Every structure is written in structure tokens, then in C-alpha cells.
């Protein structure tokens, strides 16, 4: 059987699967090798992703991981990390999110996969390799449409007073917030883009409201115009991935189609199509 | 004489007048007491100011500082590194910028004062103290038409194509920087909001391009917008203060305009202004 692994930036999702059948599911976290060093995540390794599989480790014949920050460069140092968590697996391929996406989505033809989550991203899939990439420069100069971004800018309206009478008040009560309270944990407290990608269940279950919808309309457009139309190829359907692509797939779809383009899929997770992607290439 | 000090997110402008006339005028950096502490500050007193003054150390009969971080709360503890520097001197009194801006731009008359350098900011300014304030709430979350936002704003639709062909690779080549150094700088560096400031005159020097222009233009007007319309008292003329105020004043002029606003005054320094203040209002 074999181990696939997600990360994003937020948690890790593992499964254990046997010929396109999922036989283990389980759900770690973090894991950077751009990020995070050797032994701060060979912690990880031993302590969330061994104790998790335990038992069938032995039945893992291959490992495939796919991972924000999994540069070229980094990549061969999670492989040794990995390696050394099963010392008797035959192969382990360590590759980045962006190229687990398109593989999900596109699985082998042509196509351009997108990524909608904490941060957003982009690439241009041939069907075996990505061919072109927009960096999103993150949450603070670019990562359009992310969730991280919908936070910084439906906060930054709220507490400015662009929104309807009562919303802020709502907002820093549900969450007992204050406005220095924010201000610390976006300017002084770690991976503040977490912090503001974790207010998005309070803007989706607010898009009744005209300001909140037109805001994240706004910012997933603006994620095509300079993620997606530059790859000069609306002939080729947009593939989406990610917990703000799903949460937001009515906006979205809206958007994609006021611009003339046309929506490939959005789905929340790729990993059934992980699983059905290394089921049916081997090698 | 007098010692009057304005501190910015850059650096602290000093000056020893007599009368409401100039006689010294010093140029020191930082010095913040919410964003420093007692010693780290305690060595810039007596290390670049008081090297600076070092003469007429003795014939400083009060001092008046205005610096941004000088909040109500931290500005006591300023006081008592100014009144080591000067034992000998019969006022200190430590008050914000933002105050220092409207006393310089509005004297004793009511009216609303706005900063924009680094970072923006602005008040309801009655006469004698501030009445209403909107929290800046920083370069990621706010403080637009700021230099640090035009930066982040500029730099990120430079690198994803949407200024003309060539700019990009202009910019970068001027600067010697990559789109790697810039996520370094912005994510992994100190200040950040000061290296993104930094690119303000290449932006000035490049208002003839549409792109660039409508940047700074829309900027400006979610400016007014999310922290001045909110005052509700467009019969109040808008003074401003500061480098980007300054540097784009037409700019300014025509978005003020544009909204039936009417512009009070710009000015680059508040610090002519102070010197008549504290030649006007002794106590």
C-alpha cells in the first residue's frame, strides 16, 4: 500500500491507500520543509505521522508528498526525514501543493489548477508537469481570494466603519476581540496570516449582506486578473482546490462566468484524486 | 529656549528655537516608547541627541516631544529618559504625532489633520485637543494612501504584470532586488513596512504612466473615505502633513477635489508649525 500526504498551511492530511482504496485517513499538521528545519520536523514525523499509521508501517511500499514549500531545493530534505520514518520504503517523492493540485484535478491532461485556502496560488498544467507559475507572493502582496487576504480586508473595512451599523460589534464579540488585540496578533504574534484566514465562517455566513459579498467578489477577481488570465489560455477550464474555493464556490462560479471564463471544478480536498492519480500512474 | 522633537516611523526631527525663532535643528533617528523601552531609548538620548544639543544643554528651559507610540500610557516613561537627559529643565511635556501634526497644521482653530508618510493617520482636531481619531491600524491592515501601502500595493501588481512591459524589470534593477528578496524582506525582515516605504520616489517619478497614477489616486481616496468622510465635517478644510502628502500633494489635490472636499494646507514638516505654537501657547 501506499502513504499520501497534503500539507498546507495549516495541517498535514494523510491516507494510507491500497490500489485507488483508502484504508487509513489520518490528520497531522504543519510539516514546511522550507519552513521548518531537519529535527524541528523530524519531530513531527515520529510523533504524529508514525503513532497515526502504526501498524501497517511495514506495508508501505511507497510515500508521495505533496506540500507548500517543498521548493526544489528543500524537497530532498523532507525525502531524507521521510526516508528515515520508513527505512524499508522502496519509493518516496516529496513534490509541492501546487503540483498535487493539478494532478487532483487535471489528472493527466491539460489545464490550469488553482488553489484557494489560507493563501491562493496558481500554475498552467501540460497533464504531466507545470509548465507555468504565477508566485503568489503571500498574504500581505498577494495571495488574492485566499482567506488570509478576506480577513485582512474584511477587518480592515469592518473596523473602518465600512460596513452596516452593529457588524464590527458582532464581530469582536463573537470572537472577543478588541481593535489592540488585533493589531498585536497581525503585527506581533506568529503566522499572522492564520489569525486572518481564521475569520472566514463569519464572512461566508454573511454574504446576505451586500458589503461582505462584493468584497469577496472583488478580491476573486482580482485573483484571476493577475493569477490567471496572464497564462493567455480562457480555452482551458479552471480547476480550484482549497477550503475557501469550496466554502465560496457560488461566488466564485459567478465570478469565473462574469469574466468568460469557464469553471473546470472545485472540490475542498485532492485527495480522492490523489489517490485515483497514483493508482493509475505507477510510474 | 525651547527643544522640540517630531518622531516618525524613520526617524526624529530636532530643533532649539528661541523666541519662534530657529536656532538649531538636529537630525536623530527613531525613539518611540511603545515600540522601544527605557534603556534601548536611554542610549539614543545621550548618544544622538544630547551630542546633537551638547552646548546649550543648559539654556533648555522646557522641551516638547511629539512622536508617534506616545501613547497616554508609555508617554510617562519618555518624559523620565527626556528629564535624565536634562535634569536641569523646568517642562517636559511628551505628546503623539498626531497631535504635534494639528497643532502645526490647525494652530488653535478646530479642523481635521492627516498624516501621510510612512504610515497614515488622522483626527478631529477642536481647537485645543483631539476630539475623534480613527486608528491607522498599520500597513496591513490600514493606514492607506500610506507610502508603505502605495509600496506593497505597487510592488505586488508590478510582479504579477499589471504595470507596462519593462517597469518590472526597471524597478527590480534599480533596487538590485528579486521577487525572492522582496518576500524575504517582507516576511522574514524587521520593519518591513519602512523597506516597502522605501520605494516611494520611484512611484513619484512614474505618475505620467496611467497604471501608476490611478494607484496612488485610489489610494489616496480610500484614504479620505475610510478615515476622514466618517468625521462628517465636510465644512472642515483638510490639512495634511508628510513626505507622501507632500511628494503627491497634486495628486492629493485633485482626490480631495473630486470627493467636494475642500484642502486646507500640505506641508512636508509640522515642525515651522510647532515652533510658533510653543512661541503662541507657552501654557
Known amino acids: 500500500m501506499i502513504l499520501i500526504g497534503d500539507s498546507g498551511s495549516t495541517k498535514t492530511d494523510w491516507c494510507i491507500a491500497k490500489e485507488g482504496k483508502s484504508l487509513g485517513r489520518?490528520?497531522?499538521?504543519?510539516?514546511?520543509p522550507f519552513q521548518q528545519d531537519r529535527n524541528e520536523i523530524d519531530t513531527a514525523l515520529r510523533s504524529e505521522v508514525l503513532p497515526a499509521i502504526g501498524q501497517k508501517a511495514s506495508?508501505?511500499?511507497?510515500?508521495?508528498?505533496?506540500?507548500?514549500?517543498?521548493?526544489?531545493?528543500?524537497?530532498?530534505m523532507l525525502n531524507e526525514a521521510l526516508d528515515s520514518m520508513l527505512?524499508?520504503?522502496?519509493?518516496?517523492?516529496?513534490?509541492?501543493?501546487?503540483?498535487?493540485?493539478?494532478?487532483?484535478?487535471?489528472?493527466?491532461?491539460?489545464?490550469?489548477?488553482?488553489?484557494?485556502?489560507?493563501?491562493?496560488?496558481?500554475?498552467?498544467?501540460?497533464?504531466?508537469?507545470?509548465?507555468?507559475?504565477?508566485?503568489?507572493?503571500?498574504?500581505?502582496?498577494?495571495d488574492e481570494g485566499s482567506g488570509a487576504v478576506l480577513g485582512r480586508l474584511f477587518i480592515g473595512s469592518l473596523l473602518k466603519g465600512q460596513m452596516p451599523e452593529g457588524l464590527c460589534e458582532a464581530f469582536l464579540?463573537?470572537?472577543?476581540?478588541?481593535?489592540?488585540?488585533?493589531?498585536?496578533?497581525?503585527?506581533r504574534k506568529p503566522f499572522?496570516?492564520?489569525?486572518?484566514?481564521?475569520?472566514?465562517?463569519?464572512?461566508?455566513?454573511?454574504?446576505?449582506?451586500?458589503?461582505?459579498?462584493?468584497?469577496?467578489?472583488n478580491s476573486f477577481d482580482d485573483f484571476l486578473v493577475r493569477n490567471v488570465l496572464r497564462y493567455n489560455r480562457p480555452d482551458l477550464p479552471l480547476h480550484f482546490i482549497?477550503?475557501?474555493?469550496?466554502?465560496?464556490?457560488?461566488?466564485?462560479?459567478?465570478?469565473?462566468?462574469?469574466?468568460?471564463?469557464?469553471?473546470g471544478s472545485v472540490l475542498q480536498s485532492p485527495m480522492e484524486g490523489l489517490i485515483q492519480y497514483h493508482h493509475n500512474n505507477h510510474v
Do not use: W
Request: glycine share 12%; charged share 15%; proline share 5%.
Open 87 to 142: 527505512p524499508h520504503c522502496d519509493r518516496i517523492e516529496v513534490a509541492g501543493d501546487m503540483l498535487g493540485a493539478a494532478r487532483a484535478l487535471c489528472g493527466d491532461s491539460e489545464g490550469i489548477a488553482c488553489i484557494l485556502g489560507t493563501g491562493s496560488n496558481s500554475c498552467l498544467f501540460d497533464g504531466r508537469e507545470i509548465k507555468a507559475n504565477v508566485s503568489p507572493l503571500g498574504y500581505i502582496l498577494g
Open 192 to 217: 499572522p496570516n492564520r489569525f486572518l484566514a481564521g475569520f472566514s465562517p463569519f464572512i461566508a455566513q454573511h454574504l446576505d449582506i451586500p458589503a461582505v459579498y462584493s468584497l469577496v467578489q
Open 242 to 263: 482549497g477550503s475557501v474555493a469550496f466554502h465560496y464556490r457560488e461566488v466564485l462560479s459567478s465570478v469565473i462566468k462574469k469574466r468568460g471564463l469557464t469553471l
Open 173 to 187: 464579540q463573537e470572537y472577543g476581540l478588541t481593535s489592540a488585540d488585533i493589531i498585536e496578533s497581525v503585527y
Open 26 to 32: 489520518f490528520q497531522t499538521s504543519g510539516i514546511n
Open 59 to 76: 506495508s508501505i511500499r511507497a510515500v508521495y508528498f505533496y506540500g507548500a514549500g517543498c521548493t526544489p531545493a528543500k524537497a530532498p
